[PDB]
Design a protein around this ligand. Structure first.
Ligand SMILES: *NCCCCNC(=N)N
Lengths: 381, 41
């Protein structure tokens, strides 16, 4: 069993083209400020792939740091994302764009980030006592007033029924307090925490919000396939839903032609589980392998909206077509359903929050009820 | 993280989406999970 960072090292060094790209994607980052530092401004920018690999290996046993405790005013878009911080500027280069589209690179990143995820769900933090996972969160700043207030404020902004304290909003283990970071056993349990009963009541409407999320796009009359790479990123159902590689979904692509696509963004300080947007019977479910750190040319250096200091934020429409993601298609033309035909739910990874976790209640042939928790994002690949 | 919800053409004819979702530039906060996104008309 090989260190996945070491497998990645060998991929880079044993392929002449990837070896080239792994240098050029750093050479193409400008030397001048602000690019001498990563987007947080707190550390020097990494300039070679060996330092990158060293840091990736070190990160395999680290939880993300809440760096806003001691540095409240620096850019905060990459809170939660230590890998993203390292490669953010290289992602915006022509050679970096090519690198992070390579399927072998992305298999290696998948294995690295999945090894990370093993640590993030480890309540011992890899052999540091039964409370190691919890202690690592406290050490990383997450029990600070700044972090807890941020989490409470973000939950409160979407509702009129605002709560004073974290424990009134989210479920956490017994005897949890701010001082012991609510006794969360590990990052993964904190990350996928559930709302307390009655804090997110299920509305009477036929369609409810599937994620605690910030509206991004609403597109009507979408095409079967489209030039998703052109400016404005028109949605391309065929690519998004994975009909490229699974003929079984192609009939659903056809049935969504002329339909509407709604997209919304989940921040790092938001609830990360998925709830059933409608009641109905699951007719299709898939997971689709893809990219992690792929963003548009417009989001890169010299781009009309780049370089993105928190890529792939400004590329969210684009990555629905290529990022690690999942597909769920629900038939509402059933008893107790709203009779609004087929509804698609497509969770899409961003960077190292790309683990798409379908819960067992979404198996094809099962019926889900509007508001049921049906899965979650995790930090990982 | 991000996610899409996808609806069929004839279903959209029957649905009224909330403005914060249908006109996303007006949104200033998260929408609450489980809250109304669209209603039958
Ligand atoms: N959808 C998970 C949060 C993504 C935050 N942005 C980023 N890591 N670039």
């Amino acid at each position: 069993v090989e260190n996945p960072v070491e497998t990645f090292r060998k991929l880079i060094e044993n392929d002449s083209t990837l070896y080239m790209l792994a240098h050029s994607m750093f050479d193409e980052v400008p030397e001048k400020a602000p690019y001498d530092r990563d987007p947080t401004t707190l550390k020097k920018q990494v300039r070679n792939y060996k330092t990158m690999l060293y840091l990736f290996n070190t990160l395999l046993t680290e939880v993300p740091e809440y760096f806003l405790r001691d540095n409240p005013n620096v850019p905060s878009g990459l809170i939660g994302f230590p890998f993203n911080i390292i490669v953010d500027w290289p992602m915006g280069t022509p050679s970096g764009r090519q690198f992070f589209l390579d399927t072998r690179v992305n298999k290696c990143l998948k294995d690295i980030l999945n090894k990370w995820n093993e640590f993030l769900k480890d309540p011992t933090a890899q052999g540091n006592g039964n409370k190691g996972g919890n202690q690592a969160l406290i050490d990383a700043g997450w029990s600070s007033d700044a972090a807890v207030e941020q989490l409470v404020n973000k939950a409160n902004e979407s509702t009129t029924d605002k709560k004073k304290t974290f424990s009134e909003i989210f479920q956490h283990p017994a005897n949890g307090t701010q001082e012991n970071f609510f006794n969360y056993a590990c990052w993964d349990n904190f990350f996928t925490r559930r709302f307390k009963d009655g804090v997110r009541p299920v509305a009477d409407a036929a369609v409810v919000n599937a994620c605690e999320s910030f509206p991004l796009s609403f597109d009507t009359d979408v095409s079967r396939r489209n030039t998703f790479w052109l400016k404005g990123t028109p949605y391309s159902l065929h690519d998004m839903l994975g009909a490229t590689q699974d003929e079984r979904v192609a009939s659903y692509v056809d049935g969504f032609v002329g339909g509407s696509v709604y997209q919304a963004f989940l921040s790092a300080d938001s609830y990360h589980c998925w709830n059933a947007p409608v009641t109905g019977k699951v007719v299709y479910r898939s997971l689709i392998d893809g990219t992690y750190f792929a963003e548009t040319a417009a989001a890169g250096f010299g781009g009309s909206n780049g370089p993105d200091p928190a890529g792939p934020d400004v590329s969210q429409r684009y990555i629905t077509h290529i990022a690690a993601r999942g597909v769920l298609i629900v038939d509402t033309n059933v008893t107790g359903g709203a009779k609004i035909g087929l509804v698609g739910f497509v969770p899409v990874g961003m960077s190292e929050v790309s683990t798409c976790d379908w819960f067992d209640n979404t198996e094809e042939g099962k019926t889900i009820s509007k508001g049921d928790v049906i899965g979650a994002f995790h930090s990982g690949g | 993280x991000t996610h899409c919800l996808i609806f069929q053409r004839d279903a959209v004819k029957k649905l009224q989406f909330i403005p914060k979702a249908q006109y996303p530039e007006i949104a200033t906060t998260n929408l609450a999970v489980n809250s109304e996104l669209a209603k039958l008309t």
